Design a protein around this ligand. Sequence first.
Ligand SMILES: CC1(C)S[C@@H]2[C@H](NC(=O)[C@H](C(=O)O)c3ccccc3)[C@@H](O)N2[C@H]1C(=O)O
Ligand SMILES: CC1(C)S[C@@H]2[C@H](NC(=O)[C@H](C(=O)O)c3ccccc3)[C@@H](O)N2[C@H]1C(=O)O
Ligand SMILES: CC1(C)S[C@@H]2[C@H](NC(=O)[C@H](C(=O)O)c3ccccc3)[C@@H](O)N2[C@H]1C(=O)O
Lengths: 333, 333, 333
Amino acid sequence: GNKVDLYGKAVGLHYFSKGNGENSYGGNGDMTYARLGFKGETQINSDLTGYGQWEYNFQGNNSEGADAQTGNKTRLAFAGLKYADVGSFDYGRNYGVVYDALGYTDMLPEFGGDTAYSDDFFVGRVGGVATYRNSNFFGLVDGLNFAVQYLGKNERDTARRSNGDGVGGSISYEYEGFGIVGAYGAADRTNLQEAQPLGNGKKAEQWATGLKYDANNIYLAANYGETRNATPITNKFTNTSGFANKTQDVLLVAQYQFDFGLRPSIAYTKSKAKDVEGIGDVDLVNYFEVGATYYFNKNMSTYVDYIINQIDSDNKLGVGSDDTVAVGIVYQF
Amino acid sequence: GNKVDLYGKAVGLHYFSKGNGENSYGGNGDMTYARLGFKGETQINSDLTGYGQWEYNFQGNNSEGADAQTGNKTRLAFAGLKYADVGSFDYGRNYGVVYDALGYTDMLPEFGGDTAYSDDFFVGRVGGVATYRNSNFFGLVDGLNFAVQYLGKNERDTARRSNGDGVGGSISYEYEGFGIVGAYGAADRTNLQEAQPLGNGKKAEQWATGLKYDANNIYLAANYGETRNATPITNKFTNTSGFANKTQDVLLVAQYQFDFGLRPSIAYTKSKAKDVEGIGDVDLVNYFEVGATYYFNKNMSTYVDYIINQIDSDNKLGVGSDDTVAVGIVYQF
Amino acid sequence: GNKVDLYGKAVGLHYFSKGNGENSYGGNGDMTYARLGFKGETQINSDLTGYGQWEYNFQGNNSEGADAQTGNKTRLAFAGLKYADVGSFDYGRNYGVVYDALGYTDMLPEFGGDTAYSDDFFVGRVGGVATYRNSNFFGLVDGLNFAVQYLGKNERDTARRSNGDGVGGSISYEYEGFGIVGAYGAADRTNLQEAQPLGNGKKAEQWATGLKYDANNIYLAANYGETRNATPITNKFTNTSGFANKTQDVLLVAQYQFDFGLRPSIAYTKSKAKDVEGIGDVDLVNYFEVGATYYFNKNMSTYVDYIINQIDSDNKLGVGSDDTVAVGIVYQF
Ligand SMILES: CC1(C)S[C@@H]2[C@H](NC(=O)[C@H](C(=O)O)c3ccccc3)[C@@H](O)N2[C@H]1C(=O)O
Ligand SMILES: CC1(C)S[C@@H]2[C@H](NC(=O)[C@H](C(=O)O)c3ccccc3)[C@@H](O)N2[C@H]1C(=O)O
Ligand SMILES: CC1(C)S[C@@H]2[C@H](NC(=O)[C@H](C(=O)O)c3ccccc3)[C@@H](O)N2[C@H]1C(=O)O
């Protein structure tokens, strides 16, 4: 009794930005890519299930020459066990636990989810996490779920892609369409993260909460969160980099799903850093979004995504100020 | 109603060239590689089909050490829609439209197809193409097909792997075994392509025509084509590189398919550059070919391919002059 | 009549070593990875079968940034034919023939198999091998198998990953649980291998023999082998590298498989180099091992592996002396 699904998609994707598009939100040009993966689960006995998952990213916008590898990477690589009432445990490359919150608004046709950085402690996909998860409080309280997650030190060649050891967890409740969630983690920073000109401190911290309605074809959701010494930042003007001492982040999203296949989306997003050594307060993300996805079926969809960038042109960090529109076609199985 | 085929092959492949084989056609040594991909199509309603495709190259002749990645790349990555009578549209990494012509002679057991360069405007696989295709002139004229294709600027780190924006198209007719085809595209060159010592001009151009017989177990085909500022060239003697100001290209091919599984092949190929700054006229490809494929079934074949190099040893560009023989075994599914 | 199995596993894997763990056996930290591959065989007629195989390694412990590619590689890439009584022939990336011996003890839950180096002439996976194999001496002598294998020159960018041409073979006999095997190959070294400070000679040589019991839930096996100029070595103290002039190697292993799924393992391993220019005699591997695998089913297992390192701290080459424990969870299909 083993079920494995091999899964994948090919994504025909173009970004439109005024000229450059180095001073825009999304960049400009060909952004085609494909994904492949497997997801597997085995029924060991009536109370115990084993599972694993691997997912990979193939960029489809590189030449077949020296740049062929750029942006190719594993996204997910993990296995675990799920015991009847007791819960699930898994280890590997997985979603940070705070993403159990940021998942609420990470719903745009192409952009959005700006605060769920990869290899960023608890907010995105990350390497070396042991994750425990519980549904319906041991079978006892419908809709009450929680989770804890242990993050091992990754002492990588770059500050940006590193972490020290850390712990994080999340708790959420769901009653007929509404969903409330909270998530928090902290972790040691590594001497290489600390040696950076931007960011000063020994612990990195991230939390977010999330509020959502999700029934009757409507999707409304908000997320508010903060970070100390965790959000990666770069100053376009001196080529310095490191981490934002604090940030505050809000993301809102409203969508509707028509039965004929259209799903319009409006979103708002702003993320403001504080106490950035040499600058003080400066915005990182600030935009409104309109877009839509048309779903032909479960296998085929198309979409447009328009980001109305509100970041000003004098922005102390050199964060792009121009709008970006993405157009995509998708085959997935 | 979705059909996905996962497909692939493992190819046991060796090149034999006198010693080096740095002054030969094909090189010398282990050239084993594997391919994997998916091809998917979904029936959305009775007139509209969605599809996508991804194909990858794994070299099998690298160590498991630092060179493990060499020659690995995505070949194809695209999705599109196909509407009843109206035609197909797809975007991503795909075959340049002029390859609708070069496809005629690109039929050898191992070599051949010398003019269908990758990341070369319209002649090979290329990134960032929107391709429209029409069969039987909107259902109205059996055998009359056409296609147009828009190529977006790829401003890559190398001249060789770049293009500016361009348009190209192709038209072909097929009546009981015979096939006639024509194809043409042009495109902007990028300032990096132009800054090269070899090649001077703002537009790159390529066209080819193709003539073919393909029934009763016979395959005869020819292709003639020309290029301005599009064919990539390198001068072995100064380590300079860029693009051939003009080239003229002919490729011929004759094959027969015995019912017991053998398929011998004889081919001719020559490609001559003109107005190469510092040299004038110099050949790039010039050879005869004999070889054969033995097909055990649809899954298993083997083959030999022998290239009788006619390029002389004094060739002004340092193009290899030695013969090359390839031997290959293939499992594919 | 074609059978293709797509296969794979996701492996949740952590190494524990005292602090560093740069002076240990296994290192320290996240060591998650996944594997994917295909294995295919086609029945061409009643006496002739075609087949091929490709297998790849995706590390799951890299970031999604610049280091994304580290330790990713093809492991296997080959195709061949199998003729009724006559035997099998295959070409590509495959297991060196001497591994028909080292296979005996390469059975640990995580470590072990220390002498079966990749890209190491005949002991591990290697590129460019033509391998012939025979079972039951042409159908005439049950349990008597042999094999020969031709290795083509790989003139790679590093000494470590190179070889010249070579031949190697193996012979083995199996009678109700017992198994005896012998294997030997030699090959030319390349001028780059020879230009190395460590290792002096024109031919590289490796042989091993293997003795085993394998029935009634017991697995006992030993291997003894020697090498001239083939075992790759590095001297931590001067950053010099190359090849051990001689080594002698023994590996022993004892395991039992309980029906409920547990499989404990005890192993011994030592490999001693000789005539290492600048040092004389120095150990390379020397440890005892205890560990266990618990098999939930064919799809799911977990395991611990504990290496009691016996290499001393004054070891002339800087070979790590600390213990290492690995813990792993595995989903495979
Ligand atoms: C439903 C999925 C097959 S898709 C979804 C998540 N994967 C994706 O969203 C990716 C992607 O982000 O591109 C995906 C790739 C290919 C097809 C569909 C989704 C994976 O965690 N989830 C899978 C799952 O857990 O079942
Ligand atoms: C019939 C195919 C499965 S094979 C053919 C083209 N692919 C290949 O020729 C490749 C290759 O060039 O190696 C291939 C890989 C593996 C098996 C068979 C073919 C792809 O465009 N076409 C596929 C298709 O469009 O159906
Ligand atoms: C039984 C296999 C499917 S697994 C075994 C060898 N492969 C592996 O052991 C790999 C690995 O070393 O990780 C493997 C990957 C994924 C699942 C099972 C095994 C391959 O040579 N053999 C395959 C075979 O020859 O049948």
